[PDB]
Design brief:
The complex is a heterotetramer of chains A (about 300), B (about 60), C (about 280) and D (about 280).
Chain A lengths: L6 E5 L3 E7 L6 E7 L4 H5 L4 H10 L10 E7 L2 E7 L3 E2 H6 L7 H20 L2 E2 L8 E3 L5 E3 L6 E2 L19 H4 L8 H16 L9 H12 L27 H4 L5 H10 L10 H5 L2 H4 L14
Antiparallel strand pairs in A: 1-2, 2-3, 3-5, 4-5, 6-8, 7-10, 8-9
Chain B lengths: L36 H5 L4 H13 L7
Chain C lengths: L5 H5 L5 H22 L7 H20 L7 H17 L7 H15 L6 H6 L4 H20 L10 H14 L10 H13 L8 H16 L4 H7 L6 H20 L5 H14 L4
Helix pairs in contact in C: 3-4, 3-5, 3-13, 4-5, 5-7, 8-10, 9-10, 10-12
Classes of the chains: A alpha+beta (about 300), B mainly alpha (about 60), C mainly alpha (about 280), D alpha+beta (about 280).
The complex binds adenosine-5'-diphosphate (ADP) (2 copies) and magnesium ion (MG) (4 copies).
PDB class: transferase
Keywords: Complex, cell cycle, kinase, transferase
Assembly: tetrameric
Amino acid sequence: KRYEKLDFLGEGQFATVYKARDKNTNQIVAIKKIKLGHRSEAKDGINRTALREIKLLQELSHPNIIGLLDAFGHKSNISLVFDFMETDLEVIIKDNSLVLTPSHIKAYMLMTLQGLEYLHQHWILHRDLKPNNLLLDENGVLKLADFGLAKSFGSPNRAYTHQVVTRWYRAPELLFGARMYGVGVDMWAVGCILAELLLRVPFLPGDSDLDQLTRIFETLGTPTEEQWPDMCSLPDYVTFKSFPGIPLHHIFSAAGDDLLDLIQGLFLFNPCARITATQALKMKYFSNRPGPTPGCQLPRP
Amino acid sequence: ALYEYQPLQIETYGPHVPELEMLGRLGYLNHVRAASPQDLAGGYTSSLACHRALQDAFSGLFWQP
Amino acid sequence: MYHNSSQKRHWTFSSEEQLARLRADANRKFRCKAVANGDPVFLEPHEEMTLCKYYEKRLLEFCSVFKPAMPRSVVGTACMYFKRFYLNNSVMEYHPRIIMLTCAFLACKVDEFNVSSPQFVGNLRPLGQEKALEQILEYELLLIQQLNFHLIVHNPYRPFEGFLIDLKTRYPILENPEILRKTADDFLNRIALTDAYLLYTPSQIALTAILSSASRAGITMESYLSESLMLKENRTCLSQLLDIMKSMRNLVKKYEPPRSEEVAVLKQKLERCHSAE
Amino acid sequence: ENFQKVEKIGEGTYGVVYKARNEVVALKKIRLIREISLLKELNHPNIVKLLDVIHTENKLYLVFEFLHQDLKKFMDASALTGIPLPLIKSYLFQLLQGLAFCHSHRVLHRDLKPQNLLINTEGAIKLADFGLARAFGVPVRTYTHEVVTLWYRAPEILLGCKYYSTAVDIWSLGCIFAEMVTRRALFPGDSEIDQLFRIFRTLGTPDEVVWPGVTSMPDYKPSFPKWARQDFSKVVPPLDEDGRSLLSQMLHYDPNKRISAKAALAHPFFQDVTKP
Ligand SMILES: Nc1ncnc2c1ncn2[C@@H]1O[C@H](COP(=O)(O)OP(=O)(O)O)[C@@H](O)[C@H]1O
Ligand SMILES: Nc1ncnc2c1ncn2[C@@H]1O[C@H](COP(=O)(O)OP(=O)(O)O)[C@@H](O)[C@H]1O
Ligand SMILES: [Mg+2]
Ligand SMILES: [Mg+2]
Ligand SMILES: [Mg+2]
Ligand SMILES: [Mg+2]
């Protein structure tokens, strides 16, 4: 009876989110109640996804990462308490009434990259980056969320499960079945998110894994063995027809030179060569003018 | 107000850990398992494993409760 | 990372006096609850410690013979869960057998070691297995609450490997640090028997094990501390590190394993206490 | 008011499932059209029965007969001893009768899997989970971004075909059949491409001789590895000649050549079928 449920926010396949108040600080919070699921998963105890989110968010503290305020339950039921976020980036993108100026795009990129840099310094991969996982508060602060797929990286012999992001933002090494990877997967997702911000529509909207690979290669060209040295050794590799690709200044006609360099860095086929969050933050595009807009001035749907 | 990159500073309470790119040149990578070509195709290098092991070895080495 | 972890903030304590105080407070609180509910059946805190040590050994055995192969880090996490739970709770309220099984079960899920619950409960030694699974499921949330939802446990094994890499790289005096691995591993086991996991950082434990093995082998490695770690410039820090290691070695030699007959008497007492309330 | 809730069963894609008592029944509480209507239409001994639909202003309640466990849990329990061959045959017969009834009414399950097949104590098995069902042409749920299990998808779906036929259900059933005989998944793929390559490595790579129109599929690639077709003797040792023949007819690459449920019911495999 600590929380007074007062609104229904949404229901997913694996959880249900409500609005509530703490009754002690009168703070508005979001409660994510985790579903038991099927009869078999109910007998296995508390959901592994909830345990993953709890164990990862208890060890992280950054302005641009969602904060876990509390967690309770009864028997195998469990509820996670988060700070309430007004909206997310997907709602901003699909809202035709608001204009995304270059400064807004730079600000949204900056907050995402700083959160990602803090996350990667602690040897954690988000693995589920997409516009609806970047939540916006009333003060225009972006936070990464939905840590149900996040996992620590760095220790060898830790292939583990094959869970991957939705295919529109999956990196080509993931689409080829790579089990061991680094920060490149999140960086490719970040490039896809930036492309979505620039075009206001999904950049590579494939309807299947093979269709996603086909779209990647038609838009950015089929990579050779010089660009991706050991690409043919991935478990789910298939040879493709060679595509010239489209020059990036044609796809993003309004993009300047610095933004173009950032995009090429984010969309490199070699996972090792792909820029990291620190390298991306040091890129000249962020230090150039105009600067990112203050969070209080960011567009609100 | 232009943005300027400021490095992320976290206190580790331990000896300085060498930078990731320097590991091979300083000879650290001669004492870790090499990364297979399949591992390399995904972006996983031996430098990451060595860096993680060293950071854990030096984390909080001299910190008092 | 450990240096901003919940283990460092909330689960490393200044002295074993604090540990004894928390355990005595738990014992007294349970006694007050029982006597307000409505005397020789009560167990004193040292008897509780003996029982906790015995069941920690049992948990080690269980995680050793577990199939499929239980990763050593998962075993470490389970043992740390057991220690943290019985720091603030009494064995007279929650039976150490069920709690040890629940600790192993939560450790397997937290450390991403995927095992189906029927197989886990089949590792036990029929209907009894089903009942045991039922109790494990009933105590999972209790254990997680008693841990304050702090599930990541930093073990000394990874710092051990990091130190071995650093010694192989920057300490040519040691011809082969791998000669020190067996004896350092044994010393790590002995340390894990004591309460040092609640008193020292994992890197300190690993380095203490390494230097203890070096000393037993006859090699002297004060050069590694003074020179390689750049401690020759800061001597007070070197003194603190050496005193930490000396305290850890003292804890290791002062440890006493539980005696069989005392364990039998205490087990009878605990069983009688778990059938009368 | 009449129903006394006993306990919570599970919380699937929508709503909550409750063991209740009036007879032990299952109650689904949905937040508050095609699915309920489809369930009323589908009356059959081998389909889960929609007993009553209680309607409230902000809630919906559906009553079903209670089935004590599903097939997946049953196979998990019988992992060592196995499932007796007569039980396999009876379960397959009942599932095929239910499938034939669904297909006669232009209904496409699309999501057959052992976890969606509910059994009871007396040896009956029923189809459930009609959330991905396709009645006539329209889907029952127009907007559902739910993940789908991948181990029982037909190759035509894996190659991007948008024309769903009834044969896909037959494909899934065949896989389940094989699983019940081997206590292991036939095609346990980690992804779509791995799923397709496991299928190819088990049955051979499809060419225009065996599957005409396969090279013009939306996601067909000429560079696909050309695996050979291993015989069915190694893939499913325990099965007999009639069972192997039925499995082969159920696992044809070409959907048009794939066996139908009514035609499957007339197979010699079920000559001596008796429910145990
Ligand atoms: N802290 C929060 N404040 C407000 N809304 C939230 C919060 N966290 C999640 N949500 C809402 O819940 C929805 C789903 O959250 P998510 O964690 O992505 O669920 P799933 O893991 O099932 O995809 C999002 O669309 C988001 O709008
Ligand atoms: N009539 C019933 N008898 C027994 N169990 C049922 C019944 N109906 C549903 N269930 C169980 O309730 C759980 C929730 O199922 P449901 O939400 O309907 O499936 P889905 O989420 O896959 O659409 C499932 O595990 C199912 O086995
Ligand atoms: Mg989400
Ligand atoms: Mg999620
Ligand atoms: Mg389902
Ligand atoms: Mg469903």
